[PDB]
Amino acid sequence: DIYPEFGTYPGGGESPIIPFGSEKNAEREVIHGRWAMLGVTGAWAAENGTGIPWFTAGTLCTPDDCTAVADKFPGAVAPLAPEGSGYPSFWNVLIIEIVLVGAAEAYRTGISDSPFDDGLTVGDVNPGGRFDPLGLAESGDLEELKIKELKHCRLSMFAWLGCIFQALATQEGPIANWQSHVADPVHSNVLTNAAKGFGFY
Amino acid sequence: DIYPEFGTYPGGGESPIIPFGSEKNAEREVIHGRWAMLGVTGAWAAENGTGIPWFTAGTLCTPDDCTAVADKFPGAVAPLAPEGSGYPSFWNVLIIEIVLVGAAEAYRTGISDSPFDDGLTVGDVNPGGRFDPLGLAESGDLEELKIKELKHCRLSMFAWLGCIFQALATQEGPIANWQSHVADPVHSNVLTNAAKGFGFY
Amino acid sequence: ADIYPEFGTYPGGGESPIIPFGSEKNAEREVIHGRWAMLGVTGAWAAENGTGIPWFTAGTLCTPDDCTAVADKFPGAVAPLAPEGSGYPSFWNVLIIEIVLVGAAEAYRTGISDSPFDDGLTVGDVNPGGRFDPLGLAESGDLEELKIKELKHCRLSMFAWLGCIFQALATQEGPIANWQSHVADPVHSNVLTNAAKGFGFY
């Protein structure tokens, strides 16, 4: 069996708890997983590198101050910024964020015409035409690789939901919570935190 | 076109996010919308004219005392109560509103027969048999006015949802949150209040 | 039956194991006795919650000489029942009005006196179905089932009134007072502990 766990891939199955409904729901699922995966690994890396929890990283960069981000990146040869000048600013990045992500979005979904105009079809999660220069889509069992990615997608989203609920309850951070649990698993758990209260009880 | 924004009205096509399901859902959407129109408009007007938050307005009338509600109307020529505080009462307002709203609801749905004795049909929204003393429904484009009503329904409900979550976070009031936003658009928003922790973090 | 699961049965539903149903007038008597009992048990329930006087002592408050005590007994009343200055619900006043109103209603219920209405209302029928049921709840509801509900409430409330009278005779404390004592500690407050104390006589 390809998918021995509880649920099954959309292509074949029944979706036991929630009905399958639209196929756009499956499109969203994959995209949510492909995103949350990047989010979870980014929160992991930010906690490991800087010790700053992900959920307050936005406090760092603000309209008045967005210079602190420059010195955070570990092992960089020169800063992010022009040193004292600190050209990077919240708005400086924001205009860049909105234009670049909006272009990437729209050329993905087909709100605007595809610039690549290379036969790629919008509304498919797996293009496999240009976004795989390495050819791992072409080679190997492509369907099995869709399965693995899906599994990683669902795991990462569930871990993301865990991360947000741990940020709400513990207020410490994902990796800080991981270190607390590993240092002592018996007396550092969700139920131990509930016994102590989540800061509200 | 008719519905250029995201999504569509019940007859326009398939729902993007939640499948349409039962036909009664459209009726619930309209009724909830109209109640949210009333609710948002009341929350605005009471906060603008008086200044009390709508959410704490519940505590203001209580069976210990419901005279603070009296005379708290802008430009009120006629007092709500006599000079006597005893005549106005929380249960006096409650009993009449229970019987009036229960009658209105039962007549609208058909638990009890229509006293109006009109062509207005139960299990139906905006019959228009008598609810529109002015014939601009039929004189104007009835379908255009219906889609306009529905767009205002969805706007008012989404705004009411935002109002309740702002009350839970900001605890200052919807209109008062508006005032804070315009007073300082960049230092007063969600992200700033999240940096403050919504009063809990 | 399927509907009536109580120990006994309703008249017309079948026949009771003990004292089986005889004359239909007995069934009319049962329903009317129930109806007055529902009213009576509810009155004995609500009055001493409002003011604390057991129903078996509430009679003497109004007397031919003085009946001021019954005035202003109802909780929440905006004003006195009759002038605060000089309450005028005298026992004779109560009597003279009530005997005429109750006698009229009774004779008009049973048709010994010519009916005022003559709206098709047929005496000797427990369910008149006329002006008495303006809501016409019976019309919407299922009348057989509703008759069974009425008789179940009839028997329950008549049994409750029997309980009220015998509790008065044993403990002379009051129905809700007996309730509150039992909820306070049922194990040490019940019929058998009052029997151990001797019911106030032994």
Place this chain on the structure above:
Amino acid sequence: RRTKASVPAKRSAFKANKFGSLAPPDLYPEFGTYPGGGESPVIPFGSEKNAEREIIHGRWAMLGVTGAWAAENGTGIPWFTAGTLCTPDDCTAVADKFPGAVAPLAPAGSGYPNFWAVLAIEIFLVGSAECYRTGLFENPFPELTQGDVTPGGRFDPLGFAEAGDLEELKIKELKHSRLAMFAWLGCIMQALATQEGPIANWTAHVADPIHANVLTNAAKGFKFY
């Protein structure tokens, strides 16, 4: 050893005699409808499995509501804090929690329910049963069907199912199930809002009915505003 294969001819210690249905012919005059007898009033029927899921959550929530009720009546400890008693450390306390218990789970001294001991027994018993109920493990009782919430063989030793009307009893259980689940939801929301046990909230609400409500505690912000 030879094969006897005699006739047991044993009868149930208690076997309820036929009592039939004790309900009116109408069976769900309440809001909504039982599954397999009409259309769901509001929420869409997710799957055929959802009926059985409702039954299981219902029976579990019945048992949970009665447990919180009896625990608070017998000990005064709220259900949501009763977990803090038995822990890997100092699970001795959890023992004497049953009023009238002739003996303690923890005899005086070291003798005691260990959290891990209790836990290990809990996994080995409850998980086994949970699996045997569902398609996991196997079927130790072939006469019964795994995946059926109403097996009604050895699981009704008193035979109430066959003694009465089966389907009215089924809907009766379903109504009790939905009532207890909604009551359980009320209990968790009350625990969140007031930080006091269910029977404590009940007592506060019956001592002074006019106050000690949702809206009374909301006037204080549910201790958060």
